[PDB]
């Protein structure tokens, strides 16, 4: 586990606009602090829909393809300490569960976003940077920039994955 960077190293998108970040995004890159065993099945692209509600939370629905069937994951992101930051969950961690901090590093709303997450699940800590696109196409100059940003947070290139584009389940 590479240690998570201090939040002073993680930019926050200026003048974040929640109603423009709304909608469907594909997970087109991920860089995270664990592992990566080459002896596996390739990680398939999935989609996340951020639906902004009048109470300024997002209802966040992911859809993806397993082996044979579609899967869904639904949860709420609530505004954090400043615009572009969120935490997981309406009520803070019930019985035994997951907590997360979310910071939108950069977005232009109609093409891509880079979003930093720190997560605890079953007392285990991890972090990732997720690269989102409004379309599935990922070109080389954006792959290069995502690798550079990931390296700036302490992650080397072997911890960076560009999920395989697929048609099942996600559109």
């Amino acid at each position: 586990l590479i240690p998570a960077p201090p939040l002073s190293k993680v930019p926050l998108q200026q003048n974040f606009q929640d109603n423009q970040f709304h909608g469907k995004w594909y997970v087109v890159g991920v860089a995270g602090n664990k592992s990566l065993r080459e002896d596996k099945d390739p990680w398939k692209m999935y989609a996340t829909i951020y639906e902004l509600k009048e109470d300024k939370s997002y209802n966040v629905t992911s859809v993806g393809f397993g082996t044979k069937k579609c899967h869904y994951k639904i949860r709420t992101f609530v505004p954090g300490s400043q615009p572009g930051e969120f935490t997981l969950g309406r009520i803070k961690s019930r019985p035994g569960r997951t907590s997360a901090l979310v910071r939108v590093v950069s977005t232009n709303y109609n093409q891509h976003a880079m979003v930093f997450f720190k997560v605890v699940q079953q007392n285990r800590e991890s972090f990732n940077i997720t690269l989102y696109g409004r379309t599935k196409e990922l070109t080389s100059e954006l792959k290069e920039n995502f690798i550079r940003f990931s390296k700036s947070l302490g992650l080397p290139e072997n911890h960076i994955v560009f999920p395989v584009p697929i048609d099942q389940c996600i559109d």
């Binding site: 997970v27 991920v30 995270g32 990680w43 398939k44 999935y46 996340t48 992911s62 993806g64 393809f65 397993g66 899967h71 994951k73 949860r75 992101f77 997981l88 997951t98 997360a100 979310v102 979003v115 997450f117 997560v119 990732n128 997720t130």
Partner: peptide, 6 residues
């Protein structure tokens, strides 16, 4: 399936 984000 949901290997990124939260």
């Amino acid at each position: 399936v949901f290997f990124a984000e939260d």
